[PDB]
Amino acid sequence: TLLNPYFGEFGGMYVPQILMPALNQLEEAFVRAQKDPEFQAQFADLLKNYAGRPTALTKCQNITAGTRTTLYLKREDLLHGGAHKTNQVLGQALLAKRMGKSEIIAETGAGQHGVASALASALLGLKCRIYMGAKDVERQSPNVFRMRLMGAEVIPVHSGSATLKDACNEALRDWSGSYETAHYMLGTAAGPHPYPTIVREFQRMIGEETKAQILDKEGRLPDAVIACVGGGSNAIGMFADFINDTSVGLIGVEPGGHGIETGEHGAPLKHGRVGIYFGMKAPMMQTADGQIEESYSISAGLDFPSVGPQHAYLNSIGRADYVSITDDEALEAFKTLCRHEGIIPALESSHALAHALKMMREQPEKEQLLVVNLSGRGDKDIFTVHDIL
Amino acid sequence: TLLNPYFGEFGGMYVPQILMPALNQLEEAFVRAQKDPEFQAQFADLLKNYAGRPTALTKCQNITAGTRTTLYLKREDLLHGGAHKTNQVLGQALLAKRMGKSEIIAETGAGQHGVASALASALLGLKCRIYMGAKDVERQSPNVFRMRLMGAEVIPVHSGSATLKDACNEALRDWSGSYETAHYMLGTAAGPHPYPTIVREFQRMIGEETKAQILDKEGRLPDAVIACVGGGSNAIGMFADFINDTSVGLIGVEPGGHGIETGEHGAPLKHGRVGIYFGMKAPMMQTADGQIEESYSISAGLDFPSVGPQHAYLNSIGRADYVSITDDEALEAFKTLCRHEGIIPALESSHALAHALKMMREQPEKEQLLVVNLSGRGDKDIFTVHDIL
Amino acid sequence: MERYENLFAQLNDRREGAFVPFVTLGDPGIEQSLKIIDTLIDAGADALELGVPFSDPLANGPTIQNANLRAFAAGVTPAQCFEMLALIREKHPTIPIGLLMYANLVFNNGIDAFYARCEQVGVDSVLVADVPVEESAPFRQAALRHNIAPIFICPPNADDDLLRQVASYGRGYTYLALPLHHLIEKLKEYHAAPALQGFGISSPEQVSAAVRAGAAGAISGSAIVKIIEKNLASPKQMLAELRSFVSAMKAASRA
Amino acid sequence: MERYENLFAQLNDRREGAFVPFVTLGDPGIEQSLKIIDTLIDAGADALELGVPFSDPLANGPTIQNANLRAFAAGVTPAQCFEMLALIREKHPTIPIGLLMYANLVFNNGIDAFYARCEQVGVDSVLVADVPVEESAPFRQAALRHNIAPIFICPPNADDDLLRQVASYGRGYTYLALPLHHLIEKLKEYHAAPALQGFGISSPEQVSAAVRAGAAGAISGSAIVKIIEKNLASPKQMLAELRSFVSAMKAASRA
Numbered sequence A, B: 001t002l003l004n005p006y007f008g009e010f011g012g013m014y015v016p017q018i019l020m021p022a023l024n025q026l027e028e029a030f031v032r033a034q035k036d037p038e039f040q041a042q043f044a045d046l047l048k049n050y051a052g053r054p055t056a057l058t059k060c061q062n063i064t065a066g067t068r069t070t071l072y073l074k075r076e077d078l079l080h081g082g083a084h085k086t087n088q089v090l091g092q093a094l095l096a097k098r099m100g101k102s103e104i105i106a107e108t109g110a111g112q113h114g115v116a117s118a119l120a121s122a123l124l125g126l127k128c129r130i131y132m133g134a135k136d137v138e139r140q141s142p143n144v145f146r147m148r149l150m151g152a153e154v155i156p157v158h159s160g161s162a163t164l165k166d167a168c169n170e171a172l173r174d175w176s177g178s179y180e181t182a183h184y185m186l187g188t189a190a191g192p193h194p195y196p197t198i199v200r201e202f203q204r205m206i207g208e209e210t211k212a213q214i215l216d217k218e219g220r221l222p223d224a225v226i227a228c229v230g231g232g233s234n235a236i237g238m239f240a241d242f243i244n245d246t247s248v249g250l251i252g253v254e255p256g257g258h259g260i261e262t263g264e265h266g267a268p269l270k271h272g273r274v275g276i277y278f279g280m281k282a283p284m285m286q287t288a289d290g291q292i293e294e295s296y297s298i299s300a301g302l303d304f305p306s307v308g309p310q311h312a313y314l315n316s317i318g319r320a321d322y323v324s325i326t327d328d329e330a331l332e333a334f335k336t337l338c339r340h341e342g343i344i345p346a347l348e349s350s351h352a353l354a355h356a357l358k359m360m361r362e363q364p365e366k367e368q369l370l371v372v373n374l375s376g377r378g379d380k381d382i383f384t385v386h387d388i389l
Numbered sequence C, D: 001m002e003r004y005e006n007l008f009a010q011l012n013d014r015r016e017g018a019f020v021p022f023v024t025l026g027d028p029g030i031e032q033s034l035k036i037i038d039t040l041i042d043a044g045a046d047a048l049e050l051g052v053p054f055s056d057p058l059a060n061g062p063t064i065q066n067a068n069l070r071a072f073a074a075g076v077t078p079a080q081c082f083e084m085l086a087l088i089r090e091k092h093p094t095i096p097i098g099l100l101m102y103a104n105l106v107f108n109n110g111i112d113a114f115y116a117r118c119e120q121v122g123v124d125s126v127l128v129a130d131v132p133v134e135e136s137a138p139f140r141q142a143a144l145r146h147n148i149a150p151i152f153i154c155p156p157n158a159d160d161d162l163l164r165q166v167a168s169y170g171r172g173y174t175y176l177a178l179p180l181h182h183l184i185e186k187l188k189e190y191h192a193a194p195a196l197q198g199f200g201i202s203s204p205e206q207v208s209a210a211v212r213a214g215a216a217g218a219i220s221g222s223a224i225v226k227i228i229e230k231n232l233a234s235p236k237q238m239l240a241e242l243r244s245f246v247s248a249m250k251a252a253s254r255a
């Protein structure tokens, strides 16, 4: 390979031999794209004029009144599409084009990645097919209509559990036979190399902007940047530019679901064990036998049974710290932001906010400048929350 | 008054005597606010760091391929809240505060203005009560939950038709008794002076940005700027900075509903007659007797039985031209933008886009640089459209 | 116009105040409405303030709104109102009749034309609810040309300049933060048309108090509509109850 | 390890190719599975490729996926598989047994430990589906230490370097854009383990053709699972049909 597929012991390219050439060509295309000012100019123009970058950095005083915490929210909820997913989805599409490909293959659970894949493909003239498990299909009807509206072809999978992992399989089987003309658009900073690396690089503007912005508003770097961790893309995008700023804490929040002790959660980095699946060596939800399990969370966008390899690595060396947040804590954070700032955050993002509220509340006299990555908007969560309250 | 309440023969302050002092104090507060650099700095900071301004100006090549039309979309759909409504709602809230008021009174139909009113009030520490007609309540449940989530108090009206006009009445009755501590946050560029004037000024950044942006991308002003006309705020906000640029066409699109000839439309400016209602002298939907009627449209955000007085005026002198667009034309424009650009526009905005597509299609060899104000996003329309197709 | 002058004169000779009830034309129906009005006149009402059903009473409370709904369901149109007005006038030659209108219905087919019809049927005054003195120019000139009294509302949050405008602009009577004696005395100083207290006149004690403050009388708005809304089921008893109420209120103006 | 060497030698003396069927351990149940396997061996299969049920066969098609589902419903665990493997070996001492595995199940409780158990039960080779030659170091070293043959897949989109790695890394047999004669000849040149054509071997003509191309034999994957899926209702006839299929395919390797 041209780049290191590993982050310590985590990462790699655990795919059948037939898929290696596909990964190798993609890696080489990425490296050339990364050094081409033309590609960069093109990516930037799209992010700026189409997606709406740079996103705002909102200081939320109402929520922190009476404490010594100063909180800022990186406004990815204001990005075209409703979430941070759009950034990388645009870079990958430009990459598929650099490779002379006209098709895009993807798969979804909560539907958000499918929508992002469809919007990018439709914008850049790519034929897009999306694999989604039936169980997810009939449950995420809005996003399904959304995808079709944007010309994407949504293909319902029924392999066993008929869900994400079963869709990923079909997407890969398809890709092995069509990689010559089709590009597999992975949804997060996980899977086989160069994916964790590519998704990070195409999301790193989150951290870069936040740094320039906080430096602008406060004249200093934050004390900590906090982000939710489903597969790891929004978190890594935020963390990336701050990794060499040793004074900046990097906090990743995994979903605690109904409570770690209950076993119903989506927190493999801290409460699971290493395995080899999804084409990578990384911590995962699995039985004692070695059978991968499902990650639970009130927020469907956080149900990845594993995590990105760079997160597993950053946590092994002490650089980044990962915590957990329950459905109730996320629900409370959700309600708090709506009532005090007029922003309906995505239940995924609410996990990140929930932790910062905990850091503030537990030690209200502690002076701390925090940045929460508000990864997406929660208009799609107004019903879920409604059914709870 | 300090400012002219009229635009030719249109406008005025047709409110009961008791409400005149409220209008007069508001006007004086506006004039002082407009000349105070502090207020301006405060408004701008909020628009920029909270709302997400400036909005993008997207050139849409896919939709105009094979024609000599160059189209740009002013991205108000990317504004915090989903629509342009947010801009003015923030300025008015700052105005209520300049007047030492702590409460906000409003009313809604489709729910969007209620949501915007609630988000602004919640952000700036204002107690907000919103009047909404029962018929609109049970139909716009998402926005109702949204409003309550943001701390607003939603009060269901049942006066007769239990709808917008019946809510406006309750909101006004309330305001007449509480204007000392409460500010009436009007939703569009209509009603009694200084409202048409204030809403225009707090929306004019749309036109100002578009001008700087098009001048930046193309080095020339557009040939025409197109916007939908419900009550007139997004349109007037876009038109405003271009009124003195005589070479720039200003096209306002009223909803044609099922067809002008059917009588089921919301196009009083071109297919109604002057009356005195909503505290202003303006063209309206009304019986031969003088009984105001309801404006029909597939898009609930365009059901205002009247129009802003400045629009009526600009149309009397030849400055701006107004057309009509049917539900089907708006539905087609909706589908086209999703499939070709990856943007789901609000059905309100789709009326504006639909007309530009008509200007392009009818004369494909005509060279024209157009700007459509994409007033809001259509995620809230994905079901309506779904029920049609 | 004139009927008011003669009424307030006769009232002063009798050293009593005027009691003016309000009612919606056509509520709860044409036949019922005409009978109610005759009962009000029979009961002792010195004048009448009649409302014409409009889309949505832009400046009216729920009670009136609900009355309008009943009028609308009964298919009462402004044209029907004028037919009712003519007949009421044909039966009662001297009672002043004021109309409570909204700008659109007056402006609809021409302002001047509206007042011409008012003069034609025998209406004495018109108060356009949503037209403040600042927008009144065309309405009052049209009213004056047609010998109709343009009535204006003098609110509690009125100031001196407003007091002066209402005084010079208004005719027939002045529809009445500041002290009651302040308004009344300043109105008399400015030679305003006799003031009729329209706020919360729902009991006899209210009428006597108003006249006591120096108001030429009192206007009972919603009070009348109330009896109507309640007795809607038994029209015969509605009349009987209206009779008694007006008699009480009117007796309270006799000093 | 060795059983393969002896098999390919005996095959060459008989101047015939090897026919290797694939089947999922525990599909459609333990008792059924054991009986199927004996029928395959009885029918003439020269070796066996056994699959162990995993969460989701990351690199397997629908046919296999559906087979895994049946195995899961029947409550078949990897521990059960090893119990089945021991018994199969206890009955048949010379037939080579290859396992088709996924990395997680091998890595789960330790790679080395996995291969130790394979050696213990009498397994001859292991092909880890999702482990390409680039990530094979630990798996092949562990396999070698435990006298297990690490099988590698030589894809159609393979290149020369890959051909060389597979040749030096693989043992037992090579699981077989480019010309068939190209792969086979280049594999022999590089001294690769005997190549077994695994692509689309579903008919006798396929087997003869493979051997004709110079492949040491053929692996029929899904073909076997098909008969199982169809005859699921009558287990007795499933066996009968499996018997015939294997007999045909095997007869086609006898030159």
Ligand SMILES: *Cc1c(COP(=O)(O)O)cnc(C)c1O
Residues within 6 Å of the ligand: A082, A083, A084, A085, A112, A113, A187, A188, A189, A228, A229, A230, A231, A232, A233, A234, A235, A301, A302, A346, A348, A349, A375, A376, A377
């Ligand atoms: C997809 C999603 C996530 C979860 O995934 P990551 O890859 O961890 O970033 C987080 N936030 C939003 C708003 C999303 O839509």
Ligand SMILES: *Cc1c(COP(=O)(O)O)cnc(C)c1O
Residues within 6 Å of the ligand: B082, B083, B084, B085, B112, B113, B187, B188, B189, B228, B229, B230, B231, B232, B233, B234, B235, B301, B302, B346, B348, B349, B375, B376, B377
């Ligand atoms: C409220 C709304 C409108 C209609 O009203 P205007 O006052 O005419 O601007 C237009 N577009 C969107 C997206 C809206 O929500």
Ligand SMILES: [K+]
Residues within 6 Å of the ligand: A229, A230, A231, A266, A267, A268, A295, A302, A303, A304, A305, A306, A307
């Ligand atoms: K996860």
Ligand SMILES: [K+]
Residues within 6 Å of the ligand: B229, B230, B231, B266, B267, B268, B295, B302, B303, B304, B305, B306, B307
């Ligand atoms: K309208």
